[PDB]
Each structure stands twice: as structure tokens, then as C-alpha cells.
Amino acid sequence: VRGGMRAVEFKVVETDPSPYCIVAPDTVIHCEGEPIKREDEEESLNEVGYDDVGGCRKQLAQIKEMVELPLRHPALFKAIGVKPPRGILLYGPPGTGKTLIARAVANETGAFFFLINGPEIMSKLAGESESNLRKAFEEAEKNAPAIIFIDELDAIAPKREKTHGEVERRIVSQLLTLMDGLKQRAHVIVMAATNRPNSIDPALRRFGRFDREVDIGIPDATGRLEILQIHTKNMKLADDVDLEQVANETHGHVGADLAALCSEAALQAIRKKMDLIDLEDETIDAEVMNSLAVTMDDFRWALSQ
Amino acid sequence: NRPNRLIVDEAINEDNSVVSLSQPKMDELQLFRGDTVLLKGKKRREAVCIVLSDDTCSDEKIRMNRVVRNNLRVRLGDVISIQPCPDVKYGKRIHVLPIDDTVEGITGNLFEVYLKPYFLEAYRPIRKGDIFLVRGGMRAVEFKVVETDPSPYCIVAPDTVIHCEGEPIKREDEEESLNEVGYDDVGGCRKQLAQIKEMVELPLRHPALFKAIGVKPPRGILLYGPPGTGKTLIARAVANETGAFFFLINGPEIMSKLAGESESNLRKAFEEAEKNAPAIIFIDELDAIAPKREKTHGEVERRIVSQLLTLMDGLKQRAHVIVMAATNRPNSIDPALRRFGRFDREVDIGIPDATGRLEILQIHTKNMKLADDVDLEQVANETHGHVGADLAALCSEAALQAIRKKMDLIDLEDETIDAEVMNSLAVTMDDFRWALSQ
Ligand SMILES: Nc1ncnc2c1ncn2[C@@H]1O[C@H](COP(=O)(O)OP(=O)(O)O)[C@@H](O)[C@H]1O
Numbered sequence: 001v002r003g004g005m006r007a008v009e010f011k012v013v014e015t016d017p018s019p020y021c022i023v024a025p026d027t028v029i030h031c032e033g034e035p036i037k038r039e040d041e042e043e044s045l046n047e048v049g050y051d052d053v054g055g056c057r058k059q060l061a062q063i064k065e066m067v068e069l070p071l072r073h074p075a076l077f078k079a080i081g082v083k084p085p086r087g088i089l090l091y092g093p094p095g096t097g098k099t100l101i102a103r104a105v106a107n108e109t110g111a112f113f114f115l116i117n118g119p120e121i122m123s124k125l126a127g128e129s130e131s132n133l134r135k136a137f138e139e140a141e142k143n144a145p146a147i148i149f150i151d152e153l154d155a156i157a158p159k160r161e162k163t164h165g166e167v168e169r170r171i172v173s174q175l176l177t178l179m180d181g182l183k184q185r186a187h188v189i190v191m192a193a194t195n196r197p198n199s200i201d202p203a204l205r206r207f208g209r210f211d212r213e214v215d216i217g218i219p220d221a222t223g224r225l226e227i228l229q230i231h232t233k234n235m236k237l238a239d240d241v242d243l244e245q246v247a248n249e250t251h252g253h254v255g256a257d258l259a260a261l262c263s264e265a266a267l268q269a270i271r272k273k274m275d276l277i278d279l280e281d282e283t284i285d286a287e288v289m290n291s292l293a294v295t296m297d298d299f300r301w302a303l304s305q
Numbered sequence: 306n307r308p309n310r311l312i313v314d315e316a317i318n319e320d321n322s323v324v325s326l327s328q329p330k331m332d333e334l335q336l337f338r339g340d341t342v343l344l345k346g347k348k349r350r351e352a353v354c355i356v357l358s359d360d361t362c363s364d365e366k367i368r369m370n371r372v373v374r375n376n377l378r379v380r381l382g383d384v385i386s387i388q389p390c391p392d393v394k395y396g397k398r399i400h401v402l403p404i405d406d407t408v409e410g411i412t413g414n415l416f417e418v419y420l421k422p423y424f425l426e427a428y429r430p431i432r433k434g435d436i437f438l439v440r441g442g443m444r445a446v447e448f449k450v451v452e453t454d455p456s457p458y459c460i461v462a463p464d465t466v467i468h469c470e471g472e473p474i475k476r477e478d479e480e481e482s483l484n485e486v487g488y489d490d491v492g493g494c495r496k497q498l499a500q501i502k503e504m505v506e507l508p509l510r511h512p513a514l515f516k517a518i519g520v521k522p523p524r525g526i527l528l529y530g531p532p533g534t535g536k537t538l539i540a541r542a543v544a545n546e547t548g549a550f551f552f553l554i555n556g557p558e559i560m561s562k563l564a565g566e567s568e569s570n571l572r573k574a575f576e577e578a579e580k581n582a583p584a585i586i587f588i589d590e591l592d593a594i595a596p597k598r599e600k601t602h603g604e605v606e607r608r609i610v611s612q613l614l615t616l617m618d619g620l621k622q623r624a625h626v627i628v629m630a631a632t633n634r635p636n637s638i639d640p641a642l643r644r645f646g647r648f649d650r651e652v653d654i655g656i657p658d659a660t661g662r663l664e665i666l667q668i669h670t671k672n673m674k675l676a677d678d679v680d681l682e683q684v685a686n687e688t689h690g691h692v693g694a695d696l697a698a699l700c701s702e703a704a705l706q707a708i709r710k711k712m713d714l715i716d717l718e719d720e721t722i723d724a725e726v727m728n729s730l731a732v733t734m735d736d737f738r739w740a741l742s743q
């Protein structure tokens with residue numbers, strides 16, 4: 001159930017007409033004050049899903065079929081002799097949803113996920129850095145089927161003309177080795193992200209490595225409208241809010257932009273309304289957050305900064 | 306929902322005894338042009354002031370300077386209640402002492418140099434426990450009201466006796482010095498401050514909001530502009546002004562530690578800002594740490610940036626902590642620092658305009674005695690491309706020049722400088738002329 005700028009998950013502990021029934025205007029509803037703890041096999045809905053991605057469609061269609069078999073039907077490859085794609089490279093400017101896309105495909109496919117971030121790896125001491133890459137790959141395999149997503153890849157593999165360092169080079173090579181090291185039982189796929197080919201070390205393309213590529217462009221008008229909706233699903237929008245308009249005027253924006261736009265319009269709304277009445281810094285009351293509504297005026301303010 | 310509850314906004318009048326409301330509010334409250342009022346705020350505190358009208362003030366808000374705002378224990382944005390106080394009467398005795406860390410360095414008769422001028426026929430209303438500021442002798446002295454005869458409040462009239470029994474009380478933790486950076490110490494920037502202010506308003510003043518909400522507040526604020534533009538000053542003020550915890554990081558400083566010892570510091574810094582959140586982490590010369598573009602080169606130089614990137618992405622939590630950095634321009638910085646969740650907000654602090662300099666000039670001459678011939682508007686008018694650091698240097702030089710001609714030749718230096726002396730000395734337009742001509 002969505003509201004007060006967030007979503008609450010509820011479990012049906014028992015129904016009178018058991019085990020199923022319809023909740024009618026007369027149905028009494030008990031809600032005895034104690035919040036149950038989530039059970040391992042009960043994925044939170046607050047998780048990334050294909051339904052949290054907008055704009056991409058053809059790209060998702062491709063990626064989906066690419067991982068379908070290896071990540072959902074591993075035995076197939078134990079019995080078969082064909083090779084599934086091994087590395088999927090994601091092209092596009094920042095805030096395009098590459099990470100979001102990779103995280104969803106994983107969740108959405110029950111796959112094990114492990115995120116690697118260049119800046120993060122590249123800040124470890126020399127040697128301590130590679131030990132991590134290996135420890136990472138090594139773990140993704142323990143829990144395969146799994147998806148290893150290297151975030152800012154070019155932060156690790158730029159070699160072209162920009163590489164320089166008896167460590168910088170020692171790392172790439174390490175990544176190359178680790179890549180070729182794949183291929184086994186329940187398969188694990190590697191997904192990386194960068195702004196464009198040119199950034200990456202040509203070696204990473206060499207077939208058996210990142211042999212598949214997907215370019216996530218910038219959304220189109222419809223794409224933004226879509227993205228807008230996704231990021232306003234938990235908030236109360238006034239009737240004057242025209243997302244289509246908002247979508248129509250944000251030409252070259254990317255998801256990260258639109259999300260920021262929504263976040264700002266809501267915080268702006270929170271500052272005029274709630275804020276001035278003043279019911280903050282305590283333990284925010286649901287009813288309050290629930291009544292507050294972002295207005296087209298609030299998105300106007302955001303689009304004008 | 307209480308016609309007497311108002312949002313404490315900034316002051317137009319720098320005088321410690323006055324607060325401004327709007328006429329329609331003065332009516333609704335039935336208050337007059339000079340009525341003494343009783344102001345209630347936080348930590349069960351109070352203050353007594355004189356209320357004037359302000360056509361630029363809004364019905365809901367109340368303008369009040371940092372002295373009163375502190376006496377009340379409220380920050381801008383906070384709410385206080387106002388009530389009339391006509392029953393107030395002329396004071397008999399008054400005991401006040403200076404706050405130790407505001408008189409170190411000087412010797413002399415403060416009463417004569419400070420109290421006497423400050424009160425003199427102004428009929429300032431004071432409530433016991435009040436702490437007020439007085440400027441002179443090229444510095445500001447802080448005084449606390451230890452006790453008033455007509456207790457707990459009264460007016461200081463030409464007849465009111467004023468005791469000042471020689472012992473300087475020690476400051477109390479929760480009593481911020483007025484000698485601290487404030488929005489009132491910044492001039493020129495306005496729109497930039499307006500932006501930054503609203504950016505940190507919620508996360509730094511209403512943390513729980515984000516515990517209960519799912520929206521993301523800006524995470525990194527990047528400040529663009531040439532040197533001496535007040536970027537550091539701006540960041541330090543927003544922090545103070547918002548009760549936020551502040552932690553300064555300086556590139557050159559970090560980049561001088563041994564390899565590894567340098568990153569350990571960045572982490573230890575971020576790690577501490579979080580301990581005391583809400584907090585503001587200001588990285589000073591950022592480009593001294595993150596230039597990567599084409600100018601980065603070093604199995605340590607790179608290892609640091611990456612470290613900063615990691616630390617940035619590491620943010621996001623309970624009471625939020627915001628990161629503010631400063632550089633001369635985009636180009637200088639590593640493009641990676643822009644990547645949304647990091648320094649996703651930018652603010653360009655240009656060079657002041659004519660009015661901006663006039664403003665800045667005033668701020669840096671508030672503690673000195675200016676002769677009547679001093680024309681700051683002129684001074685402002687001729688300093689075209691100057692920036693705050695310039696104007697401040699200009700003031701500092703004009704005063705030192707004044708000190709060298711006057712005091713200096715009479716010769717009463719190298720001993721324990723007497724307040725009365727420093728207080729009499731006045732910087733003349735001639736002194737600013739000398740400065741502007743070097
Ligand atoms: N197609 C999209 N649909 C919905 N949200 C998106 C999309 N693209 C980006 N976003 C928003 O922008 C943030 C983008 O960051 P991320 O997914 O890490 O993208 P990238 O890896 O390109 O930087 C996401 O967390 C999401 O909130």
C-alpha cells in the first residue's frame with residue numbers, strides 16, 4: 001500500500017471466512033499493534049524490479065533473453081554444449097539506470113547479486129585491490145546462478161592510451177584473467193557499465209569476456225512520462241499535476257534527472273506546507289505525510305531551479 | 306493558530322534591542338511603533354525588545370538579529386511567541402560582566418569604552434541572563450547581564466547605575482560566541498545563499514523527516530568561484546546558523562600526509578562528521594585532491610580520489626550530513642565527483658557587484674571607528690573586480706595604516722594595549738586612500 005511518500009507491506013495473518021474471502025464494507029479489520037519480522041524467502045516489494053524501470057524496453061528485452069536460460073535453467077548447460085553470453089556491457093551516460101537495470105534482472109530472476117564499484121576497488125592499497133576483485137568473483141560463483149555488476153568499469157579498465165601504473169595495469173590484467181576464468185556449472189554472468197566503448201580497455205571486448213553490448217540511450221518523451229510515474233507512485237499528487245507536461249519539457253533528461261526533479265518538488269512541497277505549520281523533528285506522523293500533496297506548482301518550482 | 310507565534314527571520318536593523326514585524330501584524334497584535342515586547346523561545350528562554358515596523362517583513366515572520374536570536378536559543382526558521390510588556394520600568398542597579406574570551410588581549414576601562422557608549426540615552430530594555438555585543442577598539446566585547454535591580458527585566462535609563470565588578474565570566478558551552486561566522490558576515494551573495502539555505506534546511510534541521518520519508522535530499526553541494534569569494538565563510542555560516550556540526554577538510558593539508566596516511570584521514574574525517582550529524586563536511590581546495598581529468602598521475606594521487614569517491618557514495622543515513630566542496634571551476638574537478646549521488650548540486654559564487662562590495666565593506670569595518678569623511682560607497686564604487694578577500698585586506702590595511710600614523714608616532718605600543726586608545730583612533734578616508742593606492 002503506497003502513501004505518505006513510502007510503501008507499507010502488510011501480511012494477512014488470518015481471515016474469518018478462511019482461507020480466502022472478499023474485504024467488503026462490512027468486513028472488520030484487526031491490526032493488533034505488533035509488526036511481524038520478514039521471512040527470508042519473502043522478498044520486499046521495496047526491491048528493484050522491471051516495474052521500476054522506464055524508457056528502456058528493447059534493451060530489457062535483449063538482456064532478459066540473454067540471461068533467461070543460464071540464470072533460470074543452469075542444468076541446461078550442464079547437459080548441453082553451447083555457450084551462453086558471458087559478459088554484458090552497458091553503454092550510456094550517467095544516471096541512465098544501468099545499475100538499476102542490472103539489479104532488477106538479478107532480483108527478478110532469483111539470481112544472486114554482487115556489486116563491484118571501480119572507485120571503490122581503485123582506492124584499496126596496491127595488491128589489496130586485486131585481492132578484492134578475486135574475492136568478489138570467487139563469491140559470486142559460490143552463490144551462482146549470480147550476476148556480477150562492475151559499476152564504473154572504466155575506473156578499472158581504461159588501458160587504451162590513458163593507462164599508466166605498475167598497479168593500474170596489474171589490475172586490468174587481473175580483471176581480464178578473472179573474466180576468462182569464468183565458465184562452469186550454474187552460470188554466473190558479468191555485467192559492467194560505462195559511458196561508451198572508447199572508455200574501456202579493448203581487451204575486455206575479446207569475445208569470451210564482454211562479448212555482448214547494450215546501449216541505454218536517453219529516454220524519449222514517453223520514456224520520461226514513464227520514469228516520472230515510477231518516481232511519484234508513493235506520493236500524493238494534486239489534480240493539477242500534469243506529468244505529461246513535465247515529461248514534455250524535459251527533453252534531454254535521464255532517469256537520475258527526473259528522479260531528482262521529483263525529489264525536489266516533494267521537498268519543496270514539504271517546506272511550504274508541513275514545514276511552516278511546523279510538525280517536524282520528532283517522529284513524523286503518517287497522517288500528516290499522507291495529507292500533504294505535491295502540486296503542479298511544486299514541480300514548476302523544481303523545473304525552474 | 307496563535308496570532309502571536311512567528312518565524313524568526315533575518316534582521317534589517319543591526320541593533321540588539323529591536324525586532325521588526327509587519328504593520329498588519331502590529332495591528333492584529335495591537336502593538337505600537339516603539340513598544341517594548343516580551344519574546345519567548347526555546348529552552349524556556351526570554352528576551353525584551355523594542356518593536357518597529359518593516360514593510361518588507363511578512364505577517365508571519367519576525368526579523369531579529371543574532372544577539373536576540375541567541376538569547377532566545379532559536380535559529381532562523383524557528384518559532385517564538387511575542388507578547389507586549391508595558392509594565393517594564395526604569396532600572397535601579399545593573400550588574401554585567403564581560404565574557405572572558407572576548408576581552409583577552411585588551412586592558413583598560415570597558416565601562417567607559419563599551420557600556421557607557423552602548424547604553425547612553427538609548428533606553429535599551431534588558432532581561433537578566435541576556436548576553437549582548439558591543440563593538441569598538443577594533444573588536445567586539447560580549448557582556449552578560451548577571452542581575453538587574455528591577456528583576457528580571459528593566460530599561461537602562463540615564464539614571465540606571467551599572468556595576469561591572471572586575472571578573473570576566475567563562476562562556477557556557479551552549480552560548481555561541483557572536484564572534485562566530487553568520488549570514489550577517491556575508492555580503493554580495495544572496496541568491497546563492499537563498500539556494501544553499503533551502504537545500505540544507507530540511508536535512509540539517511528536520512532529520513526525522515527523512516527517517517519517516519523516502520525522498521532523497523541533495524547530498525553534495527559544490528561551490529564555484531575565484532579565490533577569496535567566501536566559499537569557506539559561506540559553508541561555515543550555514544553550519545553555525547543551522548546548529549549543524551562542522552568539519553573542515555583542506556586539500557593541501559590532506560595531500561601532505563604520507564601515502565596511505567592521507568586516505569586514513571579522509572575516512573577518519575567523514576567518519577567523525579557522521580558521529581555528530583546533522584553535520585556539514587567542507588572540503589576546501591577540493592581540486593587539490595580530485596583533478597583526474599588529464600592532470601591526475603600517481604599510484605597514490607589516484608588512490609585518494611577514488612577514496613573520496615567511495616566515501617561520497619558511502620553517505621546516506623539517519624540524521625543526514627551534507628558535503629560541501631570548493632573549487633574555482635568545473636574543469637578543475639574530477640568529473641566523477643559530479644555523478645549524481647555525489648556532488649549533484651552546484652552554486653557559482655561570482656564576484657560582488659557594486660552594491661555587494663558596499664555590503665562587504667560594511668561588514669569588515671563594523672568593529673572600527675570610521676571618521677565622517679570615510680565614504681565606503683566611493684570605496685565600493687572604485688573596486689570593480691575585487692572579491693571579499695580583497696575588500697577585507699583593503700580594510701585591514703587602511704586600519705593598520707591609521708594605526709601607524711596616529712597611535713604609532715605618539716607611541717603607546719608593545720606593552721598591553723589600552724582599550725581607550727584603540728577606541729579613540731579613527732580610520733579616515735585618507736587612510737583608505739592610502740590603502741587603495743598601494
Ligand atoms: N530508466 C529508468 N527508470 C527509472 N528510474 C531511472 C531510470 N534511469 C535512471 N533512473 C533513476 O536514476 C538513478 C540512476 O542511477 P543508476 O541506476 O545507478 O544509473 P547509472 O548506473 O546509469 O548511473 C536510479 O537509482 C533511478 O532512481
Ligand SMILES: Nc1ncnc2c1ncn2[C@@H]1O[C@H](COP(=O)(O)OP(=O)(O)O)[C@@H](O)[C@H]1O
Pocket residue numbers: 490491492493494530531532533534535536537538539631665668692693694695697
Ligand atoms: N561575500 C563576502 N562577505 C564578506 N567577507 C567576504 C566575502 N567573501 C570573502 N570574504 C572575506 O574573504 C576571506 C575569504 O576567504 P574564504 O571565506 O576562505 O573564501 P574562499 O573559500 O573563496 O577563499 C573571508 O574570510 C572573508 O573575510
